Amino acid sequence: DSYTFPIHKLKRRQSQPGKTPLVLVACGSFSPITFLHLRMFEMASDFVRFNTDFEVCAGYLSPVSDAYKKAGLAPGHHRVNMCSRAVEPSPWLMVDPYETLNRNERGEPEYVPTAKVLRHFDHEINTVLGGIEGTDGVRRKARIALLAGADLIMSMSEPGLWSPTDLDVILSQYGAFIIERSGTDIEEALASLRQYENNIWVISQVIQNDISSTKVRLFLRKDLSVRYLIPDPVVDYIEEHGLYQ
Amino acid sequence: MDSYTFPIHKLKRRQSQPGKTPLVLVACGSFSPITFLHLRMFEMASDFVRFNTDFEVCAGYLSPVSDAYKKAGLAPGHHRVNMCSRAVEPSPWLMVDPYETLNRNERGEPEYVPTAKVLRHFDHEINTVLGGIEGTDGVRRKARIALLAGADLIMSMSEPGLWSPTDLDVILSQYGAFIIERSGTDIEEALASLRQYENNIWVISQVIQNDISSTKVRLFLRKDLSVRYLIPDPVVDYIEEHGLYQ
Numbered sequence A: 001d002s003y004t005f006p007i008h009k010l011k012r013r014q015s016q017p018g019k020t021p022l023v024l025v026a027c028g029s030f031s032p033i034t035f036l037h038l039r040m041f042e043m044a045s046d047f048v049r050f051n052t053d054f055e056v057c058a059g060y061l062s063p064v065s066d067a068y069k070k071a072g073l074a075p076g077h078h079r080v081n082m083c084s085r086a087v088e089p090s091p092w093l094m095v096d097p098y099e100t101l102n103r104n105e106r107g108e109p110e111y112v113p114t115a116k117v118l119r120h121f122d123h124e125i126n127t128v129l130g131g132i133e134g135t136d137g138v139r140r141k142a143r144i145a146l147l148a149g150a151d152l153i154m155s156m157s158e159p160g161l162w163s164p165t166d167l168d169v170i171l172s173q174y175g176a177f178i179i180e181r182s183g184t185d186i187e188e189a190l191a192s193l194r195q196y197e198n199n200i201w202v203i204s205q206v207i208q209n210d211i212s213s214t215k216v217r218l219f220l221r222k223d224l225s226v227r228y229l230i231p232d233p234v235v236d237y238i239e240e241h242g243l244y245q
Numbered sequence B: 001m002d003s004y005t006f007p008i009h010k011l012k013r014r015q016s017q018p019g020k021t022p023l024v025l026v027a028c029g030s031f032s033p034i035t036f037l038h039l040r041m042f043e044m045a046s047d048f049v050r051f052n053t054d055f056e057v058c059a060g061y062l063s064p065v066s067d068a069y070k071k072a073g074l075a076p077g078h079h080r081v082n083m084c085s086r087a088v089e090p091s092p093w094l095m096v097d098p099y100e101t102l103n104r105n106e107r108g109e110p111e112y113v114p115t116a117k118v119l120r121h122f123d124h125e126i127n128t129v130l131g132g133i134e135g136t137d138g139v140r141r142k143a144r145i146a147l148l149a150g151a152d153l154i155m156s157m158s159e160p161g162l163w164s165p166t167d168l169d170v171i172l173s174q175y176g177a178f179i180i181e182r183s184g185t186d187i188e189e190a191l192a193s194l195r196q197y198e199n200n201i202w203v204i205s206q207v208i209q210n211d212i213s214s215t216k217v218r219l220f221l222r223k224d225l226s227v228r229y230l231i232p233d234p235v236v237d238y239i240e241e242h243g244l245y246q
């Protein structure tokens, strides 16, 4: 029936003393989800364990609204369904369809800016649910942070797509874990953004792996195999519903 | 039963395409553990064969090497077979052949099978025992058996002592090799000495970058890092269930 914020895999009581509870949010098109998108969560989990004082409590996929001005974007409920099946075996990853459900007065899909997405997660976990219980018994605000590849930081540093007020909210109140791989040179983007350099965590990608959703759609159109680039249940879903022609 | 049975449950013995020579791909490797890259290599070879050759793919076989190969990080053969089998159970065309891991000498010890003898074994089981592959014209033909390999295996063929020159001649004159070339890397010079034993060599360019090697997966496992989404979930579950890779 109606929208319920997913919590079936949210750790609501911490296990590690002295650690700040953390929730990771991946905002993207996910058209379709790939193994790289999923691997980025695991890389972020590993980095947090050994390089921060955070304790990871959940990972959320946030598929973008159908109103987003982008090519190759399948219908929102399909992208949500593909993501959900991809993370069904995961013990800690969930999909939040919130962005795909936003509608304007006339009922058309309405785009949700990333700053408003992060406030939505902040609201559901910390205001509605009461935060995360520590080993000290204190229910705390989970830190909410974005999880994105290097292209997102480069996008944030170029004027035109991000308003200064949103950038300030996103990076000063929440933060971003950024996966950086070989060949990508994000040095200039960090320079233009270094006033927030303390809520920006750059994670080196040790194993090179650059599969994009765009390449996956191309392969689907040319009748090339996408097995082992995206999860099996997503391959089946795409075939069952004839997505991406 | 307890005795060895050649797997054929996904073997296509009837062709669907006219004018095509039937082809069986054999990946000889350690698979300790199998990764998504090993599986992707079969799909890339399938894509290449369909659109760039006059072959028709009839099966893909994983052939985990004998424990007698004695290499660092080589888990027990029955474990590697189980990991490959579970990894490939959802596949429509890939199978695991435990033949190499089941080979034993007189002393009951694992006995190494050189790759040339592995290909002869596939030739024997598919073409001699089973009688080959029927074409769309109703004519029964021998399937071409060919190796599917990455660049490290091809480069090893140039390591003196490792592969007999006579085995290389059999492998490359009678069977062949589909070779995955990583993006940015140029393996042509390593190939140069090998195109001298007939040109039954097909190079498949890998456009999508992917370096998930078994060596890196073992390192991550030793350092207590996650390998989920680098290797199949059933392999992750098997490794945790049996405590493999320290």
Ligand SMILES: NC(=O)c1ccc[n+]([C@@H]2O[C@H](COP(=O)(O)O)[C@@H](O)[C@H]2O)c1
Binding pocket: A027, A028, A029, A030, A064, A068, A070, A112, A113, A114, A115, A155, A161, A162, A163, A166
């Ligand atoms: N001003 C903004 O909030 C803004 C601008 C550009 C992109 N984005 C977000 O970044 C994500 C882009 O995802 P993709 O990399 O899959 O295209 C989307 O969630 C998009 O909404 C937000």
Ligand SMILES: NC(=O)c1ccc[n+]([C@@H]2O[C@H](COP(=O)(O)O)[C@@H](O)[C@H]2O)c1
Binding pocket: B028, B029, B030, B031, B065, B069, B113, B114, B115, B116, B152, B153, B156, B162, B163, B164, B167
């Ligand atoms: N003389 C030979 O037949 C010979 C020599 C070295 C390696 N090999 C084969 O090459 C494969 C190497 O596999 P990996 O790259 O996964 O370690 C194995 O199947 C191994 O048996 C064969």
